[PDB]
Write a protein that binds this ligand. Structure first.
Ligand SMILES: Cc1cc2nc3c(=O)[nH]c(=O)nc-3n(C[C@H](O)[C@H](O)[C@H](O)COP(=O)(O)OP(=O)(O)OC[C@H]3O[C@@H](n4cnc5c(N)ncnc54)[C@H](O)[C@@H]3O)c2cc1C
Ligand SMILES: Cc1cc2nc3c(=O)[nH]c(=O)nc-3n(C[C@H](O)[C@H](O)[C@H](O)COP(=O)(O)OP(=O)(O)OC[C@H]3O[C@@H](n4cnc5c(N)ncnc54)[C@H](O)[C@@H]3O)c2cc1C
Lengths: 242, 248
């Protein structure tokens, strides 16, 4: 499926760390609503990482874990519990949690979307996975503390979700007889809509999340009142072997 | 300022109707947060329409104190008197039939306003940058007023597509503030391609008109997914849209 590269290996570990830090919040949840949101998100996260059954036991354990433990103690009991559930594949290699962990996670999910679409057949299955992807991007938690970031993301996250919906639309047209034409550039996709073609950019969500990532970093100069090395699509594809 | 066309004339009247129906909601607000949100949005809405600021404050304060036991038709009559008394006849909608078109018209109207502020900007770039932040607040908090929970949930999910492009304009104005003038281009594709290069400051002419138009099409495309229906079907094209609004 997705090319194995150094950068993808980091994405994968960051993804697991993100998921670990999410289930640690369950014991602390101050509402039923938050508990249901976290539980579903973490279940979805491991889904994209028998396995469904073991994950359910892991999440249920996380739900009942003592609220009076610290993170470091939760981490100990989590490494034991994942080992006992034969879920060693859920254990992160590193636990240093930063903005990069969150970015890696979003870029990881984007790669998963692109891969599911490229290797589809079952279009109902992929259309259901996409809806789950929309829920995941809608409900990204920062876990770390940055209110400004949370405010900014809640304003512009629809940019990513919108593009997931474009893929749904493409798959719907394919179900009804117009196959997907994969194109090399975003410009072919956006221009093609301005008219019975069904053109979709290859690696669309890699590009979408890369451009979104650049925009966030450009905007923070406005946020700090300061004068401004941005990632290019050419070098991003190279780093990930796309 | 914006070209005068039949379609723009509708947009402006729809915009007034939308603003009227919004201030009708203050008397029934079930929470001080909703009250604060509604009153600021209505004040922002009339700010982008056109001492007007002070009379609008008086109109909004009247709406806050109006009886919650009135019905909409009675609110409408008192509103028509209050706007007359305050020398605000220009706030009065010509038509009161409220539909989805009313909401779309309002969103398209605001997009045209954004594009026009950028074009006429004083190169007081802080002023237009401040106005854009107000527009982001307006699109974030769009009220349907009519009943469509599915529409509300959908908009909540994808409204950031519009707001994102307002932030692209802010970034371009920030660059111009600091020495790199905006280069205007004729197509969205030119803008997105130039964003991937150096240091260009490329912005599409009439970007928000194109963005809101494209968003409008995507919503209508997606609804066929929501209905499990196959699309029947003439979508709106950017060429045809520029013609209707006499955009150059
Ligand atoms: C959803 C989200 C919203 C955020 N909102 C804000 C905000 O509003 N204000 C604020 O100050 N900070 C915000 N941040 C944090 C900010 O984006 C940076 O992560 C932070 O400022 C650290 O900057 P950095 O350059 O050291 O790390 P980053 O450059 O952001 O990321 C580090 C890693 O990601 C790589 N990378 C860099 N750019 C890209 C790209 N376009 N595409 C793919 N990979 C890339 C880098 O090469 C590096 O390997 C947000 C972060 C996220 C995940
Ligand atoms: C923010 C918002 C979100 C919505 N979400 C949903 C949803 O999730 N599910 C659902 O079923 N309905 C949704 N709707 C309503 C839906 O978009 C239509 O308005 C409704 O279904 C009526 O369809 P229509 O084509 O006959 O009228 P409309 O699409 O409302 O068109 C009304 C006017 O706008 C013109 N127009 C048409 N297309 C465009 C365009 N691309 N750009 C500019 N002008 C155009 C038309 O010529 C017409 O004059 C939403 C509406 C809004 C404003």
């Amino acid at each position: 499926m997705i090319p194995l590269t150094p950068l993808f290996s980091r994405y994968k570990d960051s993804y697991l760390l993100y998921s670990f830090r999410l289930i640690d919040l369950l014991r602390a949840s101050k509402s039923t609503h938050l508990t249901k949101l976290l539980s579903s998100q973490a279940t979805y996260l491991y889904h994209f990482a028998i396995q469904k059954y073991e994950v359910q036991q892991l999440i249920e354990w996380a739900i009942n874990a003592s609220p009076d433990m610290d993170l470091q103690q939760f981490r100990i009991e989590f490494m034991d519990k994942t080992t006992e559930l034969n879920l060693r594949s859920c254990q992160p290699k590193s636990f240093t949690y930063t903005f990069t962990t969150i970015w890696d996670t979003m870029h990881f999910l984007s790669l998963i979307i692109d891969d599911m679409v490229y290797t589809r057949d079952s279009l109902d299955f992929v259309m259901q996975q996409l809806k789950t992807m929309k829920v995941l991007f809608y409900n990204v938690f920062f876990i770390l503390q940055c209110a400004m970031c949370r405010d900014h993301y809640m304003n512009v996250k629809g940019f990513i979700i919108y593009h997931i919906e474009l893929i749904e639309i493409a798959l719907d047209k394919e179900k009804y007889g117009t196959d997907i034409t994969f194109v090399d550039s975003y410009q072919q996709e956006t221009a093609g809509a301005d008219v019975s073609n069904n053109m979709l950019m290859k690696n669309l969500m890699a590009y979408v999340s890369m451009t979104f990532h650049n925009d966030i970093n450009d905007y923070k100069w406005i946020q700090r009142n300061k004068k401004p090395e941005r990632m290019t699509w050419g070098e991003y594809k190279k780093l990930l072997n796309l």
